[PDB]
Amino acid sequence: ADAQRSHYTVYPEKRWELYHQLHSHFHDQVDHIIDNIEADLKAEISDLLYSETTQKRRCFNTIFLLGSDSTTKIELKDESSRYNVLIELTPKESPNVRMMLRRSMYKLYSAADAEEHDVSYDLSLVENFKRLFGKDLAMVFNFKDVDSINFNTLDNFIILLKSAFKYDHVKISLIFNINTNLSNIEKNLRQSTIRLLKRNYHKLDVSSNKGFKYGNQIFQSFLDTVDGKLNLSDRFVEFILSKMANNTNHNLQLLTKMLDYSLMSYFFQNAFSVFIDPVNVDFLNDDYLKILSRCPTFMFFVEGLIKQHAPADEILSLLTNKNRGLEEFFVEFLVRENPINGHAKFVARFLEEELNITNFNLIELYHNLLIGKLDSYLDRWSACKEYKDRLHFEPIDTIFQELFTLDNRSGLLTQSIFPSYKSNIEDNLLSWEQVLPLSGDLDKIMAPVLGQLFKLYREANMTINIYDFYIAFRETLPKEEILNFIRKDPSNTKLLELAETPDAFDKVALILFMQAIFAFENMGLIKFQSTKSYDLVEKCVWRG
Amino acid sequence: KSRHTMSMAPDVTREEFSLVSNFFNENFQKRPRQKLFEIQKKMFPQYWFELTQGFSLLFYGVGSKRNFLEEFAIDYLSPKIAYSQLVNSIPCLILNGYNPSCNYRDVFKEITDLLVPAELTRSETKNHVILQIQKMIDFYKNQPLDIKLILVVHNLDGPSIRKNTFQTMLSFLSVIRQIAIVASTDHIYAPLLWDNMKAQNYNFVFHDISNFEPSTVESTFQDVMKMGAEGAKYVLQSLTVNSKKMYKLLIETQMQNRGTQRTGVELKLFNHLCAADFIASNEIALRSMLREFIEHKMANITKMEIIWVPYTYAELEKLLKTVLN
Amino acid sequence: CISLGEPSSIFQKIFDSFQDLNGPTLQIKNMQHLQKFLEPYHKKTTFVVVLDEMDRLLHANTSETQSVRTILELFLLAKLPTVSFVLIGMANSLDMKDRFLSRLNLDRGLLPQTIVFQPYTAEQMYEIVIQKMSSLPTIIFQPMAIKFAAKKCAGNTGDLRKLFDVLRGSI
DNA sequence: TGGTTTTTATATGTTTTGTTATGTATTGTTTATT
DNA sequence: AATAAACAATACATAACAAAACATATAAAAACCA
């Protein structure tokens, strides 16, 4: 009723608590690491912004922050008897030379009155700032996304700032937050201005992924938060190797996402999650005792039991013939610490400072541990050759770990996080039987509306004719069902006069065809080439 | 190039189309549709639990999802979360993305009024939109974690929401923990909209919903040649009675010979022909009530001085036997 | 509706029959803001508005952005009490019905009764001129020539008093 | 809030440039003879 | 190696058009002083 008006508002667990004591505790380790790099980035700009006393003293100091994410915020020193202001210029606010000047002079001016306790918004204020506001000026220019701007505007901008170098009560500082590709930037500008730039340049790198000093760190703080109460399987962690390698800019926010979603999967379906604290042994039930039986390492050890002990009268008794000894057989292996966690923490600090190696990934270090490829892991520096015997660990085939583990053995978080998008749509439209289970008898003898043309839509050419496609569409519809369908309702009258018309079938097809190809434009599957002609269209969607 | 064309189709009027369309979309596959709707109903507690983690939930899939979102947001979730925190329930702010009249200023002016005006944020109102939301974000980093608002964005690839200065605006909203972002798109190229910068702010997760809905509301703004041969079909129903006759004499000899240029007639003889039936006095009295057929683009002229009707061969005899007769 | 180009001050001018005072700007701007305005005060007589010359807003700025939305928003009468703002709008060129969206053409609001007025040849307009000759002079000319005037003006015409205003020039 | 200016979206017009189809003209291919 | 003649195969000049660069216009959004 109201849906054509836009944005109308209206004003209409024993398991989960053990998640709640684990989740936030992990997240205290997350954000405390997040402010560490936040304090790191804010520090290394601040000292380098100051103490650089050049001899010519007629040049601005420039700073190239390579690899930076265009969101790096900056704080400034107080530095009394001089105001220090920050101006940010987003490529959305870069239309010309003119408004790049005019908005920027406006942005400092309100920042100037707020600290001060009619004028014109150009460089007139810059010289009279000594008289307009008393203390001197040191402005800084947070160019947020520098490679999207037309550089001749930027090149003409910096020559305008070059004229301000003759007043001696103002200091200029430029911050170039590039995304990447410093060699691209010295190509675009005028070479007369690069020689203006090259007085005191500083190529400080700011990257979230820099030698994995935080990537290996945040996975390490993940491991102790789940220490001894779970495991991480091999097929799980290689997914974390492969998919996180596909995102260069921000691994660290992504590793929080795919790990915490993985932990959300475990608490939501696994019944033995309650038993990670041994105080919860009183919650034991036969239904819990029944579902413990189908563990693969459980039944395999029983196959190991019979072949080792060909007397099986003991093994048959400890089966479901007893239940007290049966769970006592389980809680024998309950407290398995699995020191692969601790052995990782043993070797992680070692090569960090004993051999002092930094170009390493702790996750595949954990993964090569899971197969036994730690020997073929340390080889890539040939520096643990004196230490491959003391850092050695053979991964033991541990038992009952399949109840406390995380793995994408179901393809869940492969699907729900990285969905094969146009694959799952195209699979939905060719098949349609595994999505959908008086008038439903028609449905068992006639396809749904969107999908029935789709099989011929595959079987059509690159650019297709509209009418012959409908002519082919009329072939798929048999005649007797529609007149059985159009005459199904005796209650309505306005439909029934159309129902008795002898050309109703050929009219109801073009009505139904012009509801489906009407609905293949908002999906972008078919594009109407050369509007007001629309005799032929173009299909972009291919199967792959 | 003998091509079958949409002009050579048995056409259907306005009331005839929409009624039989309404018959199918409410009686075609009704039983399996709610049979799907009961199957996916068990996923509703799973969405409630993940949404406490501030996850921007995104729904893809074939078919319209508009009915499904409004059941899931309004009736199910929004009172369930208010009961589980402990009074009016959680305010729902939908965004109709299929409505092209959505701007960035107006919806955010609703947002800061939907959110708390604890300070004089009109002082920072001076493009300050990214500026005003940045002062909203850092304050919200140190607040007690509870959802106070859930917003819905239908058809996120819509004609106004897919604009790039609006997209980045929603990106900064999603990093805040106090608001849950449940949106749906329909495009096949929807993940072209986001880079690793925005999805870092978004942390999207995905779920399939395919009910093969007809998109009743979402078909309204869209148009094809159903929505001129049909345009001048109504003007002739309200004119003078002489214009019917002088168009009848027009349409005869213009269909005496598709309706193209070559079947047309010269201006001089047509003046004499409409002088023959005591209709046209002269050229001016002919042309003035022929400019009315020109002003509503009901006839064409190219060069004999050929005036020809731009409608098809099939259309003019339909115009003959129905409205002229 | 001549000098607006914008749907606010119409809902201001319905307030002028009240001779009162209020906060006008918000109440006349949004669709939902009109709904609060429709609670009467003295004796519960229902109100019907009359929108004169709607085609200036129809043939205003671009269709599906503002003007069709303006057309859409006015014709919505889903209010629950019988006090409803019944529209009577008027237009020149008859394209406007096909311009309506398919939801609106599903028997919604005041769109249906598309009451047209075919141009009166001489058979209803001239007889009004007869009754507008209530005060009759002696020689007001041979009235069959007036009938001759009506028959041979009705090729392209609509206003016979104005086409009597060309008789008033010849008189 | 409120008017005013500036940018954007939508819409159409202008000139240059590059592609394709086709009827006619050119050019190659074979065989006999000088 | 050259000439001639019949025939087949290919290239060429231009017609018809498409599409991108280049250009303007105005109502609606959007900043923006105030």
Short description:
The structure is cut from a larger assembly and holds chains A (544 residues), B (325 residues) and C (171 residues). Chain B is α/β, with parallel strands linked by helices and 325 residues long.
Q: Notable features of this structure?
A:
part of a larger assembly, 3 chains, B: 325 residues, alpha/beta, five-stranded parallel sheet, 8 strands, elongated, C: 171 residues, mainly alpha, DNA-binding, replication/dna, DNA replication, OCCM-deltaC6
Which secondary structure elements does this structure contain, and how are they paired or packed?
The structure is cut from a larger assembly and holds chains A (544 residues), B (325 residues) and C (171 residues).
Chain A: E1 9-10, H1 16-49, E2 61-64, E3 82-89, H2 98-114, H3 124-127, H4 129-133, E4 136-143, H5 151-162, E5 170-176, H6 182-188, H7 191-197, H8 215-225, H9 234-244, H10 252-269, H11 286-291, H12 296-308, H13 313-321, H14 324-331, H15 340-353, H16 362-371, H17 375-378, H18 412-417, H19 421-430, H20 440-444, H21 454-458, E6 463-465, H22 466-475, H23 479-486, H24 494-499, H25 504-516, E7 526-527, E8 536-539
Parallel strand pairs in A: 2-5, 3-4, 4-5
Antiparallel strand pairs in A: 6-8, 7-8
Helix pairs in contact in A: 1-8, 1-10, 9-16, 15-16
Chain B: H1 14-24, H2 30-39, H3 44-50, E1 57-60, H4 66-85, E2 92-96, H5 104-114, H6 121-124, H7 129-140, E3 149-154, H8 164-174, E4 179-184, H9 196-202, E5 205-208, H10 241-253, E6 265-266, H11 267-276, H12 283-295, E7 300-302, E8 306-308, H13 313-324
Parallel strand pairs in B: 1-4, 1-5, 2-3, 3-4
Antiparallel strand pairs in B: 6-8, 7-8
Helix pairs in contact in B: 8-9
Chain C: H1 10-13, H2 24-27, H3 31-35, H4 55-58, H5 63-75, H6 126-131, H7 143-151, H8 167-170
Chain B binds a DNA duplex (34 and 34 nucleotides) through residues 103-106, 122, 126-129.
